[PDB]
Design an enzyme around this catalytic site. Structure first.
Site: not given
Ligand SMILES: *[B]([O])([O])[C]1[C][C][C]N1C(=O)[C]([N]C(=O)[C]([C])[N])[C]([C])[C][C]
Ligand SMILES: *[B]([O])([O])[C]1[C][C][C]N1C(=O)[C]([N]C(=O)[C]([C])[N])[C]([C])[C][C]
Lengths: 659, 659
Positions: A530, A605, A637
């Protein structure tokens, strides 16, 4: 977690937990799943009202409200299969939920008294018009879109018109022919969605909208009802995110009443918590604010006058737990003992000295009883896996469970940030069977973004560090500046300049690693997810002579393609900050990839859209550089559940192949 | 290719080629780009009419028709920027094209006589209603959707209603927010699109549709006009693809006139070529057909009576070139000399003996003059890079260019197929600096699908074999059964059973490789694209003990997700053949992946949709097996142009890392 004492919580004046088939009550009594089953028309439940021990049971045929103190069924609810958006009235006899784009209220039915059809609050919900759900990308503490008034007379809810947001396709590859659905993801610098707040009055069936006015893009956050239900307070944040006005609206007509107070910031204001009224009061409330550099609790009255900053110091309140019954004391968790630790405290509403109620060094997670008279404390530290106590406040504790201690050694310490002044805390997972005579490859596990802190004084990241260390690779993590629980100045250094400071601090981590004799300086890697995927990739492109191999999962690559709310807070808008966006835009520096980097993305995602890693591979093709790739077509995600075993194997084999 | 003699071709009775700034004519004269430029209001052109030397020049401001024999401008055309769908009238003074979903005809304007607005033949074209373009997925020889009558009086065109086809998303990742477009790709076993044929009559501006009737899904292929323009012939193929009716329709009214002849097959019929009328005849035509096991030329009259199979033998006509002026002889290319070779022949229209006009062993590519009196021949063989001759037929040749010869040695030979009877031809690219004392890793480069033949007697796949051999890896290819130019029985063994025979034959290739002392039997890999990607992956899953490493590009993985027209020909429909589809469905056997396999896909691939490789990665996640991946977001089915350098580097490094 893992949970040693299952479902440990307060119910009335009892603390409670599960033991297979029993629910055990203590202040001792047991309640069996057979005892319970006999009363239906030890299982899983959601606690609705801890004070009254009211819960709801998810069953084969709708929901069953149950009173655990009285041991009696309350209501059966029919929500036509909807469970995700369930929001029960504080009265306990009605539930709001969203089904097929519209908001509904269902009335509970008493045991053998027959049911009633649910009320449709809205009827025009669709794809581009969302009712009763979280808005503003779940920023500003927003986790839902329904807000019952505290006596249940009214239901406030969000209405979000996103017809002006240009959507991103999310493709389901499982049908014979793939099927795309638009995701109305508003990207940095683009037109935001338009949220308004409706209030549905149950007695009259009338809906009124708050007159929040213009600009239509304004963020309406932290909805908080007056205890008398006459006013609905909203913390409104401008597009620049440098002004927050806390405003009162008339619940009956929707009309604007007054601005209580305004907060502003050089960098950003970020309200995260509702107004919380004092017990028995309609005129005084606690408001959390980071305005002095540190998150603290402020006592206001409802005209907007500030009575007192109640907590203060160079440390942060991390959870406000509530009040004593009289409202003369505040209970809360904070970093006062150490930013690496969490303790539970008491403070006088007049302020002054905190009293630590959980003094052992490490991490305390604490639940104050409905009384305000006692606490459940769950504790872990590097030497203590789990200590679960129950204390009658200031009347001695009772221990309920204490857990006892080849594995990778974990070292911890401090290094200086790149300013040469700020200390940074690090954890270092040593190779299994570590031999100081030897040289070892090492991997920087990096996150580095706001709102997270990876290095705390805990029972020693989801164990990926351990698995890697079992393969002979040391794993190092340092909370660089930008990270959380160290006050605003420590965080806000990154404003308008994402990646820059964070990388400079991580390279201090590398300087430290290279000072170790047992570190093979030519076998240094990097991994993160991320914001950590952004960091992994930026580090490989920025310091290619150092990082030989990385794996970047769900990485932000181009911040212009990250969402308006989070993105513009830390970076400003792309039109306002081209230099900062351009420096962080990894598409522009793909030609600097000289090591081995695998990007991994979930295809569906909806946080970091797949486009980010795809455009990076595309930029690499043009630049003639050579990354690797894996896609999880059924994941969002993060890769969740058993498939996480496949993920860990893919990532670690990449390192064992190449680093 | 590469082209040593640029643009070599016939113009009237001259053969012609470019030499930088000149266009050189011979039967000698030159025509310069300066000579030419002076005549405008050596560049690139499209030849419209070789007999008359009429061409069109693509310029800065529309198209310029030019007469190369007369050295004069013919017409200027304005096609509003459209170039892809250009189809010039045989009269040379009008051009049909498609723009914004609709079919247009533009009239050429004579030099300084001013222009006229284009005629809109259709006005209701859209996304789901396609006019004037290829249909039926470009199967059955269909490459376009406009068919001028031979005197230019009429324009026949396809109308395709695809509103019943469930589309696949094709995503453009380059805009700020990604943008999806539906691709109406009809998958095996699903409702096909509905094609009808319109004829626009230029004199009256009337359109009539052929009354092709039901079923609406029928394939309308190989449109062929009668020389008198009264009839439009269509080869209609049923959904089962085992019947082809050649039918005559009235061009004036659209009414069905008669069925000339019907062809049928146990496995499939596949018409690929139009009816070609004899010179000066409206009643006799040549039709190509593979009905006797081998592609041959048949002489029919227009009532449907078969006059004579003109060519015959256990070999195939591979290009029909035309007739002598009198229509007493046929000219054509075939495999008669060898399936590994291509020669140009003459045969009497009464049949009997062929006369080879290009007797040298190897590959001849040949152009018969507009006369029917002479040929340009371009020749290459393993020992001859390029020999370009011009022969006055049966009056001695004139050589125009002859090219002269450390690199990988290429070996060739024959092995038996898995039936132990059929011979298979193989080529083997030896490691650079091959040393027979040594052991070498080897890679099977496989294609193996219908319509292709990779092993011919040529000047020694786009050179990926050579690059790999430069890295020390031998590359082996064998044309297994299913492949082309070996007659129908050799091909059709795969019917209903894709992969099975092909793999059994490739494993004979491996048996041969293992007989070589210099082969490291533990370092065998496999690579292919498309059908070859299907084969690579099937081989790794089926023979995991043999193939250690593969790279599968644009692979078919689930044939239920391949198109109706190609797919159902070789496999039948999924509902008719579950056992065959299930055996070839690689999603079902993902758990058998034990080696290293990289799949590579272009994201906007409209041939093998991206879904194929994505669902394979998804199946591997569930099965806990570990492939690798690369995506080319800006590419379709094949990576084309300079990016092909990135492709070759990715594929070869995968092998040098892992094999
Ligand atoms: B990630 O680090 O998981 C992702 C990319 C950068 C920030 N981010 C987030 O997930 C943040 N959430 C949001 O952006 C929400 C969805 N608006 C997290 C880290 C909470 C702040
Ligand atoms: B490939 O091998 O390039 C692909 C997958 C299997 C067949 N195939 C084709 O591209 C065929 N064309 C079509 O399917 C057309 C687009 N209908 C080729 C090989 C020509 C037969």
């Amino acid at each position: 977690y893992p949970e040693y004492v299952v479902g440990l919580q307060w119910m009335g004046d009892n603390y409670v937990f599960i033991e297979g088939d029993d629910l055990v009550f203590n202040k001792t009594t047991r309640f069996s799943a057979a005892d319970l089953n006999a009363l239906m028309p030890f299982p899983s439940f959601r606690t609705l009202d801890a004070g009254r021990g009211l819960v709801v049971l998810f069953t084969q045929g709708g929901l069953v409200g149950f009173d655990m103190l009285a041991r009696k069924v309350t209501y059966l609810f029919d929500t036509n299969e909807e469970t995700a958006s369930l929001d029960f009235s504080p009265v306990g006899d009605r539930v709001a939920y969203v089904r097929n784009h519209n908001l509904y209220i269902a009335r509970g039915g008493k045991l053998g008294e027959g049911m009633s059809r649910a009320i449709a609050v809205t009827i025009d919900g669709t794809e581009t018009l969302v009712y009763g759900q979280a808005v503003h990308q779940r920023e500003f503490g927003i986790e839902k879109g329904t807000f019952w008034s505290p006596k249940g007379s009214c239901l406030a809810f969000y209405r979000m018109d996103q017809s002006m947001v240009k959507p991103t396709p999310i493709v389901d590859y499982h049908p014979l022919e793939a099927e795309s659905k638009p995701l109305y993801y508003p990207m940095a610098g683009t037109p935001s969605h338009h949220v308004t707040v409706g209030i549905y009055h149950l007695a009259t069936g009338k809906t009124v909208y708050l007159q929040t006015g213009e600009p239509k893009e304004k963020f309406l956050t932290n909805l908080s009802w007056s205890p008398d239900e006459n006013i609905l307070y909203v913390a409104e944040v401008n597009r620049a995110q440098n002004e927050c006005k806390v405003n009162a609206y008339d619940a009956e007509t929707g009309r604007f009443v007054r601005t209580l107070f305004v907060e502003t910031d050089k960098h950003y204001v970020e309200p995260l918590h509702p107004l919380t009224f004092l017990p028995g009061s309609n005129n005084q409330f606690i408001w959390q604010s980071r305005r002095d550099g540190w998150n603290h609790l402020y006592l206001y009255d409802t005209t907007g006058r500030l009575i007192r900053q109640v907590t203060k110091g160079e440390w942060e309140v991390t959870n406000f737990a509530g009040f004593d019954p009289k409202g003369t004391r505040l209970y809360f968790e904070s970093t006062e003992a150490s930013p690496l630790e969490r303790h539970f405290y008491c403070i006088d509403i007049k302020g002054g000295k905190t009293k630590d109620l959980t003094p052992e060094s490490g991490m305390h997670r604490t639940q104050l009883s409905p009384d305000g008279s006692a606490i459940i404390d769950i504790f872990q530290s590097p030497t203590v896996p789990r200590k679960v106590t129950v204390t009658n406040i200031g009347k001695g504790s009772h221990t309920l469970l204490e857990a006892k201690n080849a594995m990778p050694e974990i070292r911890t310490g401090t290094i200086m940030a790149a300013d040469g002044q700020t200390p940074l805390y690090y954890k270092l997972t040593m190779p299994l069977h570590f031999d100081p005579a030897k040289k070892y490859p090492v991997i920087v596990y990096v996150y580095g973004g706001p709102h997270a802190q990876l290095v705390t004084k805990t029972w020693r990241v989801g164990g990926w560090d351990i698995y890697m260390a079992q393969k002979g690779y040391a794993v190092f993590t340092v909370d660089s500046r930008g990270s959380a629980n160290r006050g605003a100045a420590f965080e806000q250094v990154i404003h308008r300049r994402l990646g820059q400071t964070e990388m400079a601090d991580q390279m201090c981590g590398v300087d430290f690693l290279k000072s170790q004799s047992w570190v093979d300086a030519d076998r240094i890697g990097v991994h993160g997810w991320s914001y950590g995927g952004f960091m992994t990739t930026n580090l490989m492109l920025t310091h290619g002579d150092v990082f030989k191999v990385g794996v970047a999962g769900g990485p932000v690559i181009d911040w212009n393609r990250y969402e308006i709310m989070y993105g513009e807070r830390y970076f400003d808008a792309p039109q306002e900050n081209p230099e900062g966006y351009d420096a962080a835009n990894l598409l522009k520096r793909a030609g600097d990839l000289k090591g081995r980097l695998m990007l991994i993305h979930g295809a569906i995602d909806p946080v970091v859209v797949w486009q980010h890693s795809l455009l990076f591979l595309d930029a690499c093709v043009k630049a003639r550089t050579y990354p690797d790739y894996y896609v999880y077509p059924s994941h969002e995600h993060n890769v969740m559940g058993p498939d996480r075993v496949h993920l860990y194997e893919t990532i670690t084999r990449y390192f064992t192949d190449h680093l």
